[PDB]
């Protein structure tokens, strides 16, 4: 994709060289100086934009970081507060593991059913799949587990509350991820910046050819590489739950989560 | 926007057909000064759009919190008082009323339909009497939580747990109000817009000396880049203004309503 | 201050002396190209951008702090209604302190006299207590804390519900510090010092380095460049005094009225 | 200004440039503006970022100090509100909190805490504090014992103990925040190399400037040198916000304010 | 031999090559002006500026994370004394776990062996149990959690006071999560890929563009412009791996020492 636009730029430079003979005749002059202005303007704009994209990526990485943290500490509190309640341990862990996988699926816009069935009773799978938000439902069921221990008097209102906070933290992760997935910043205004860099890159050799002659392709490819490299990297970072090269290894992240939670509950991968 | 590009092409054609008369009289326009001007304008547009983007992001975050806090509040009600479905349905009404009412507040549109749909007509009059209707809804949601505590169904601890979620909604209300009765750059936003507008119309006259017939092509391309970047900032600066795209706000209020009905088993339709 | 129209007009005068003294240039041997003024102009524009950023942030923080007053006081009034709906005497006392706090904080930041307002809202005993302090607004918080505190001794609030309302006072305490910190810590003077020199000197020497290129079109270009750098410099001017009384500053009286109106709407037996 | 030295030194180099411009072709030395435009702008961009990074450190340092005032204020309020009678505890706790500020200032300035410590506390304590290589942390632990004892005594519940405990946490965070900004500087490549670069650019600039400016060069080069060197030295100043320079923090004024605040009116309250 | 001085000396040679070969330009048909190399270099600087910005923030984040370790450990030991002044048995056990956590984290981020430092601090029954887990640092927190848990079950801590100390474990959990997130997820390798190529190629081709305008002045001006760009680029590289072993990286050994000495001073050791 990047190499296609680079090859088309080498070609366009040749078009500029072979048709430079016609330049004076057809009545067209093109200096470097105006293209330097527009060039720098674009660079400034790509610089800010690209930084904005990196921010989103870092936030996305961060939210997933919190899934692991919150889940670890929720399991920790369960063990420290109710060390004898290993039934509750196992079931809650099931939901927390389910939550992660379901979040991966949600963000990937794929089917959660395989993973859900692996981890949970089929009655719960139907309840979870029935909801507009399966991750929200999973949190509600994990909520019932601690909520029932509270009714049984095995948790106090304080110790229920400490565990409730972690579910609250997971709610916040889910909200943040949902926010980052459903936020393409006006669909037109990324396509409009892209068509700008593109149109600048292909008109540049035409302007460069006066000053450079046969060097035109070598300089024009180098400039275009730089600008396109930057533009496309910003594109990858913008959508961090995607399946692109420089996007979050969400399946690996989910494995780490499950393994951690299994390690904490005396069980073996 | 497309008017201003057509105005630019018109200004370019003027600059071609008049280049002869004026540059001979002793009035010249080089590219080097308009390059300094344009780069500085770009730098300023760069920083400007940065401030704009951050207002846009804060708006998204605040609205994200509505979703989050309302969800966790309804979770807490279900987990702490599994039996109290009448309380569940009342609190869910206000929470959904809160979202629509806040949207209507920011967009400066009429909430009446949404309130009449969600709430008892006594409550709707109380809410519509107030000069701060969104706050009033929050207060009502409060009483429901308060009555449950008074009835001994919530302890001070568990009342407290739900109370935090109402604070979170309060923070969202305020943050939004501050992002609405705005901006913080107090109508300089019209000066930079004109600074761009004038720079784009004087530019063909600076460029024609170097480009002759190519001028309308190169001048419109530059103008496009600057005017687009300026337009984007203006759009982002004002996430709740009467001209903004209302899709995501509506999408948000719909999401939460749907979520909440699901959470209280009002969905799906019974078999 | 609209010195922007003075300096724009001084710039026209600076172009005029440049056009007519342009002959006496090579005689002396003084030449001024655009190129090194592009380098300087760019460098000045970067530093102007980074500075205006700081200026902007400080203004936003001022808004946020004031925004929190409204939030924390709304919620503290709410809490009192839902937790103690019978206790309208306590409601009215706490409310009057909260309103007092807002007004007192405004007067403090504006360096004006809070006495009139305090006396409108509070008992002369309390006014005396507040004004006796070297930190009046902080003392109002202490008094508001005392009402909440009494309710706790009386047993109308548990340690838990006491705690829920204390946090709101902690928030108003962060507003108070915030505002104080802002009022005493400007964007460092050096910035606005350095930049005010370089931006003015630049706008002055510019028509001199443009006339060689522009002959007669020097006023209309040097002005348009100058207006651009000065607009952007004066934007920082109009954003660095958020607590003032100027048109561009925060409408703190209006905000205080908004606060008072809000807390009165929340009370009235309904 | 160490700038006034290097600004005059720039004028001397810019005379050398005016006299040498004939001999350029003799010595074989062509030197256009455009390469130094590229290098200058690159340096401006890097100065902009560096300076922004420094201001951040300034701002964070200021904020952490702000929290000291806030947290200490509310912790006194909490004691005045929850235990209104316990003045001996109030007085003891306040003296530790005041010790905390001065102690921290001395820690960050690397000066002797003993003067200010003796002014405020019992001599047994002044030696317990001085015996620890972490004096500020020690003071905190001491303030911690005071609220702890009030709880062993059953004068505070677990809840009301917690409310105060949180405020000591907040101060621990300031301590850590301040230690991080102090013991961790902005890495020495950032300062050492960037200063070489700005100055080496500043000396060479007139040599490439003559061709265009002829006689005007010493002015237009000093103006450029001012702009660049000002920005770099200001960055260098703000990087170390607990230092003693002009644009650094008034740490002495701040601890005076903290003290005046806690001790307001012989420490008497309504 | 120091990467930076080598790439400078390659650039002084690139300049003499450009001087000696300037004659052949006219004949071979290769015209190279400064104007487009200004556009290129400026763009590269902007992108270098923004990139360096990201690398700095990552370094700063790592610093804050370690700052929190010290803060949270200090206040947890402080709480232990103020709430349970008699229970020095528990003080010593918890302090040893808290010091273990610091060292374990250090070793984890350094990909080095925690055994020596852990054996120095803890009983053998514990050290093997901890090292048996694939998440040893997380395991140490679960064990510190247990101490707090036992003290609660023994009635020595109330639910409230248990809560107060539990939040301090939560804080350490976040540090661990944050640190792991920084160690495993780098600043996207595309940033180094793109910018290392583009800077190097730009510095190399530059004298060939400068030579027409600068002649024998070329080497001096070219090495200077190279130095400015290469220094900035390598500074970003040194800031990007803050858990490394360089002198420019975080003195993690010093910090862990400060932590240990700190918590021993607090208990009377
Ligand atoms: C309400 C009380 C706590 C106030 C009292 N004047 C003290 O002292
Ligand atoms: Cl956590
Ligand atoms: Cl387990
Ligand atoms: Cl929440
Ligand atoms: Cl229901
Ligand atoms: Cl609140
Ligand atoms: Cl239900
Ligand atoms: Cl009332
Ligand atoms: Cl506080
Ligand atoms: Cl009322
Ligand atoms: Cl802490
Ligand atoms: Cl001990
Ligand atoms: Cl001890
Ligand atoms: Na906790
Ligand atoms: Zn022609
Ligand atoms: Zn957490
Ligand atoms: Zn178990
Ligand atoms: Zn929340
Ligand atoms: Zn229900
Ligand atoms: Zn022409
Ligand atoms: Zn549904
Ligand atoms: Zn709040
Ligand atoms: Zn009332
Ligand atoms: Zn003002
Ligand atoms: Zn606080
Ligand atoms: Zn007292
Ligand atoms: Zn000369
Ligand atoms: Zn903490
Ligand atoms: Zn001990
Ligand atoms: Zn023993
Ligand atoms: Zn080993």
Author numbering:
A (entry chain C): 23 to 291
B (entry chain E): 24 to 294
C (entry chain A): 21 to 290
D (entry chain B): 22 to 291
E (entry chain D): 21 to 289
How do the authors describe this structure?
Human bestrophin1 (hBest1) is a Ca2+-activated Cl− channel essential for Cl− transport in retinal pigment epithelium (RPE). Although the structure of hBest1 is still unsolved, two Best1 homolog structures, one from bacteria Klebsiella pneumoniae (KpBest) and the other from chicken (cBest1), have been previously reported. Overall, the channel is a pentameric assembly with a single ion-conducting pathway, which varies in diameter along its length and is constrained at two narrow points: a “neck” contributed by three residues (I62/I66/F70 in KpBest and I76/F80/F84 in hBest1/cBest1) on a transmembrane helix, and an “aperture” formed by a single residue (I180 in KpBest1, I205 in hBest1, and V205 in cBest1) on a cytosolic helix. Here, by electrophysiological and structural analyses, we show that the neck and aperture in hBest1 are both indispensable Ca2+-dependent gates, and their dysregulated opening by rationally designed or patient-derived mutations causes Ca2+-independent leak and elevates Ca2+-dependent channel activity.
Twelve identical residues shared between KpBest and hBest1 on the loop structures within the channel core transmembrane regions were identified as the subjects of alanine substitution, as we reasoned that replacing conserved residues on the (relatively flexible) loops, rather than substitution on the rigid helices, are more likely to be informative without disrupting the overall channel structure. Alanine substitution mutants for each of the 12 residues were generated in KpBest and hBest1 and subjected to crystallography and patch clamp, respectively. All 12 KpBest mutants were purified with a size exclusion profile indistinguishable from the WT, suggesting that the overall integrity of the channel is still retained after alanine substitution. Eleven of the 12 KpBest mutant structures were solved, while 10 of the 12 hBest1 mutants displayed altered channel function.
